[PDB]
Every structure is written in structure tokens, then in C-alpha cells.
Write a protein that binds this ligand. Structure first.
Ligand SMILES: NC(=O)C1=CN([C@@H]2O[C@H](COP(=O)(O)OP(=O)(O)OC[C@H]3O[C@@H](n4cnc5c(N)ncnc54)[C@H](OP(=O)(O)O)[C@@H]3O)[C@@H](O)[C@H]2O)C=CC1
Ligand SMILES: NC(=O)C1=CN([C@@H]2O[C@H](COP(=O)(O)OP(=O)(O)OC[C@H]3O[C@@H](n4cnc5c(N)ncnc54)[C@H](OP(=O)(O)O)[C@@H]3O)[C@@H](O)[C@H]2O)C=CC1
Lengths: 274, 274
């Protein structure tokens, strides 16, 4: 476990959300080629059926889908339980689905804000909570798929960028707690630049003109970084960009701030209850 | 308009949320000493009443309170309209209320996550949307009260930190678009370190031991930065901390990314629709 080897996903039990098309579908493909057990989800029954059949073709140990909407928090919680049952456990939770709005100036569409927060952030939280016990018993891993727009802001897309930023605040804090605690569930935040997904290409078409990175490789890098158990994985179309997105200032401040807690109390209140 | 002068708030029409205690109450007092028109809100009717009477005493041009809960998006939208009518307009919207959770390791309390997102983030957005036409006609200003834990993560407090990070993703993008567009409503993100608020002193008591900055001055600095129309205002108990909080990387990458849009198309799509 220093360099990635495809063999590391052999027989591992993996959930992939938003896997009927785009990057998600690609993640399933690569996991199937590695011979992982795979449970795939999104809203479209027929699209997921195709992915499932393709994954068995490619050499998945097993492949199933459960269709539903990630704005229903009850489905999200119950999806994880079914997924565990079909696999007899869970090694990796790949949180990938997303709601995209139109690239537009914000004009007070508060329903876009709410829907984006529901689909892109709250459900990732619900999925993680439902999966935590299985991940803890397998010392497994969570991929939190985000965006450059979750580290930095871009005109158009405020609703989306709010939800992605929220992911960083929540999961980074969680990892930080897991580290002190010492939980042995790893959390990888994936910071992706523009990707040549069909929705993204259509979305950005007359609007944003920077180059797009390929989805097949993107999907691979997500699994690499999650398997290698990294805090962050950057796939952003350049080697110098990630240095400007990982602000060392925050790193230093988080480091400095830890010496400000009284760990004796914190750790013994935790053992008392909660 | 280069150095702050108390005169700049004289007769200005200001909403302050979460203003029955802590920093909010201090904001109302400072605005009253400057002779502003003030509408104050929070859930506690009797605590608000006291603050209003103190504000009139301290020299407010006028002072009123409307009590209600920022979990209720209907109240938030109707509060801004009533506030505007009491004052005949609005020059400054100070978004300060917050729900605090106990400082505890996260153990799957999804309701804390939901409620924090509701009170700390969604309501900020609803208030701003409701206020925007009055703010556009006055070319006014919004203060978005955040935290160091909205730029950086801290163990304990994950749900809170998600909400604060959300505010940065949302409002910073909003400012971006306002500059392009060219709206003339300023948005000041207030990054506060530890403040000697009663709630904060109780909350952190046996747990976090860093020094606390005074709420009276904190409240003043929030209004100076908002009146001076700053993108960001730092009040963090140190002069070098802000350097580590404002990632220059982010600013460079935002500046570079701008030249990546086709603004001709963006601006003409805006002009035809939306
Ligand atoms: N494409 C890019 O340029 C970038 C992508 N990313 C990130 O990568 C991830 C995937 O992006 P991408 O592959 O382009 O997205 P796509 O639009 O290609 O695919 C999104 C997937 O999520 C599913 N989905 C959408 N809405 C819901 C819902 N309400 N409930 C359940 N499932 C849903 C979709 O299926 P269905 O619609 O049938 O439900 C689909 O399977 C996201 O987290 C995104 O933020 C980050 C930066 C850039
Ligand atoms: N205090 C500090 O160490 C730090 C504070 N900040 C920021 O400063 C701001 C003020 O915090 P502070 O003075 O410490 O907090 P306080 O607890 O002192 O004040 C909270 C205010 O918000 C109101 N409020 C809480 N919940 C709701 C609700 N659901 N609906 C409407 N009003 C509500 C409270 O009254 P009621 O419950 O009666 O409604 C009260 O008036 C916050 O945004 C905070 O995040 C940032 C960094 C540090």
C-alpha cells in the first residue's frame, strides 16, 4: 500500500452513487475490471441495468443496482442497508451523484439552493451515517466527490458551490475527529476540474471554455486516491493548479489550533457518553 | 468613504438578526449610538423588547423588534418585508443568528446537520433574497456573519462548520456575479475567531482554551467592515492569523478562471432571460 495496484479492489465491496452515466458509470467500469463487488445507484432503472450487465461482462465479482432519488433521505438510508445485504458488508462508499442547475446568474431561485443542498450534501451525510458501522468493521473508505468549485468560487453555479463547500467543512472535520479517535475509516475528498462528461459538455458549451479532462481517467484517479486512503485527490487538468487549491495556510492553522484544545477533557467526555 | 466614521450609519436602515444577546445585541447598541434606524429579531420576545428600549435610550433614530424563528423560511421572508415597512426601506442587512450544537464528536446526529444548515445557511439566503430589491434601490450592504470555522475546520462542531463553509461558497459567488453585473450591493463576509459571548464561554469552557476577543469591539468591527464595503472582515484575535485564512491561491485561481468564460454569451443570455 504505497503505490496503487489494481489487485487492491479485488473482491472489495463497493457502493457507487450516480453511476448510470458520467464519472460514476466509469467508476463502476473500472471497479468491475478490478473484480470488485459492486452496488450501483441513481434514479434511472434502465440506465443502471445496462451498467450492471456491462460490469458483469467486464469481470465484476458481482453487480447489482437499486434505483431511487437521493433527495429522499429515507431512500438514502435504506439504500445503504440493502447494498450491504447484497454484498454481505461494505469496504468502500463512493459518493458521486450530484444535481446540476443551469449555468445562470443567481436571481433568487431559493428552490435551487435547497435542492442542491439536499441532493449534493445532506444525502452524502445520510449515506455516510448509514454506512459507518460497516465501514468501521472493514476499516473501509469513503470517496467524497467534489469539485474545484468546492475549494474556490465560480460565477454561475452559486447553489452548487454552496453544497460542495459544505462537503469540505463537514467531511474534513469528520476525518479530523476520526484521526484523534482513532477510527480507521478513511475519507478522500476528490477535487475535480472540468470533466468531459455529457452533462458537463452540454452545460458549459457556449459558456465556459477551459479544457476538459477525460472521465475514464478521472474515475480511475478517484479509486486510486480512495484506495490509497488519501485526505485529498486532485484531478484538475494541470500539475500546478492543485498547489493553488490546497491552501497551506489552512493546513498550518488547523495544525496550530489543535494545541488549543484540552484533550484530556475532550477524550474523557467522549468515553463518558455521546 | 476611506476611513470609517460613525456618521456613516446615521439615519441608515438596518436589520440585525440574532440580536437579543451576544454579538447581535452589541451590534444593535453600536448602531443605536450611531443613530441608525434598527429592526432587531430573534426568538425571545422579552429579550428583544429590552434591547429595543436600550437602543432608543442610546440614541437610535427608531427601534423595533419582530420575534420569530429562522427555521421557518416563511417567517424569514415576511420578517424582511415588515422590517422594510417599519423603516420605509433598508440600507444594511446584518445576518448574525446561528444555531450552536454541543461541542461533541460527530456520532451520526443527522438532525443537527439539517437544523444547522437550516438556521445558519438556508435562512441567510432567504433573508437576502427577500431583502435584495430594497438593498438594490439603496445600493446597500449585507454582513454575513461567519467564523474561522467557515474558512478552516475544527474538531467537534462539524455540522456548524458545514453551514459556515456553505455561506462562503454561496455569498462569495454571489459577490462575484454582482461585480460582473454590476449590482452595487456589497457583501461582507465576517470571519470571527473566538468571541467572549456567554454562549461561547459556556460551550468552550472545559474544551477549547485559546483566548477570546471582546464582543463589543467584535460588533463594531462587523459594522465598520460592512459600511466600508469590504469583501471580508477579519476579527480573530491576532494580526497574522488573517494571512493564513484568506488563501491567496484561491484569489489567483478565481482571477485566472474568469478569463475562461465567454462573457459575450454569458452577459447576452442574462439580458435575454433569467
Ligand atoms: N463533469 C464535471 O466537469 C465535474 C464533475 N464533478 C463531480 O463528479 C460527480 C459526477 O459528475 P458527472 O458524472 O459529470 O454527473 P452526471 O450528470 O454525468 O451524472 C450524475 C449521476 O447522478 C445521478 N443523479 C442525479 N440526480 C439524482 C438524484 N436526485 N438522486 C439520485 N441520483 C441522481 C444521475 O442519474 P439520474 O439523473 O438518472 O438520477 C447520474 O447517474 C459529481 O459529484 C460532480 O460534482 C466535479 C467537477 C467537475
Ligand atoms: N461567539 C463566538 O466565539 C463566535 C461567533 N461567531 C458568529 O457570531 C454570530 C453571533 O454568535 P453569538 O453572539 O456567539 O451567539 P449567541 O448564542 O450569543 O446569539 C445567538 C442569537 O441568535 C438567535 N437565534 C438562535 N437560533 C435562532 C433561530 N432558530 N431563529 C432565530 N434566531 C435564533 C438567538 O436568540 P434565540 O435563541 O432567543 O432565538 C440569539 O439572539 C454567529 O453567527 C456566530 O456563528 C463566529 C465565530 C465565533
Amino acid at each position: 500500500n504505497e503505490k496503487f495496484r489494481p489487485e487492491m479492489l479485488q473482491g472489495k465491496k463497493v457502493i457507487v452513487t450516480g453511476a448510470s452515466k458520467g464519472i460514476g458509470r466509469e467508476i463502476a467500469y473500472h471497479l468491475a475490471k478490478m473484480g470488485a463487488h459492486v452496488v450501483v445507484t441513481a434514479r434511472s432503472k434502465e440506465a443502471l441495468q445496462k451498467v450492471v450487465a456491462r460490469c458483469l461482462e467486464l469481470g465484476a465479482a458481482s453487480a447489482h443496482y437499486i434505483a431511487g432519488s437521493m433527495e429522499d433521505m429515507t431512500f438514502a438510508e435504506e439504500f445503504v442497508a440493502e447494498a450491504g445485504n447484497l454484498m454481505g458488508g461494505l469496504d468502500m462508499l463512493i459518493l458521486n451523484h450530484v444535481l446540476y442547475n443551469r449555468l445562470t446568474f443567481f436571481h433568487g431561485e431559493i428552490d435551487n439552493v435547497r435542492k442542491s443542498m439536499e441532493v449534493n450534501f445532506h444525502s452524502f451525510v445520510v449515506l455516510s451515517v448509514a454506512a459507518m458501522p460497516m465501514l468501521m468493521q472493514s476499516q473501509g473508505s469513503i470517496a467524497v466527490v467534489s469539485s474545484v468549485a468546492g475549494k474556490i468560487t465560480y460565477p454561475l453555479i452559486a447553489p452548487y458551490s454552496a453544497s460542495k463547500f459544505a462537503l469540505d467543512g463537514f467531511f474534513s472535520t469528520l476525518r479530523s475527529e476520526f484521526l484523534v479517535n482513532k477510527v480507521n475509516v478513511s475519507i478522500t475528498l476528490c477535487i475535480l476540474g472540468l470533466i468531459d462528461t455529457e452533462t458537463a459538455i452540454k452545460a458549459t458549451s457556449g459558456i465556459y471554455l477551459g479544457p476538459a479532462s477525460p472521465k475514464e481517467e478521472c474515475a480511475l484517479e478517484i479509486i486510486k486516491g480512495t484506495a490509497l486512503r488519501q485526505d485529498e485527490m486532485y484531478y484538475v487538468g494541470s500539475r500546478w493548479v492543485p498547489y493553488l487549491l490546497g491552501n497551506p495556510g489552512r493546513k498550518i492553522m488547523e495544525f496550530l489550533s489543535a494545541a488549543e484544545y484540552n484533550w484530556d477533557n475532550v477524550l474523557s467526555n467522549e468515553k463518558l457518553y455521546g
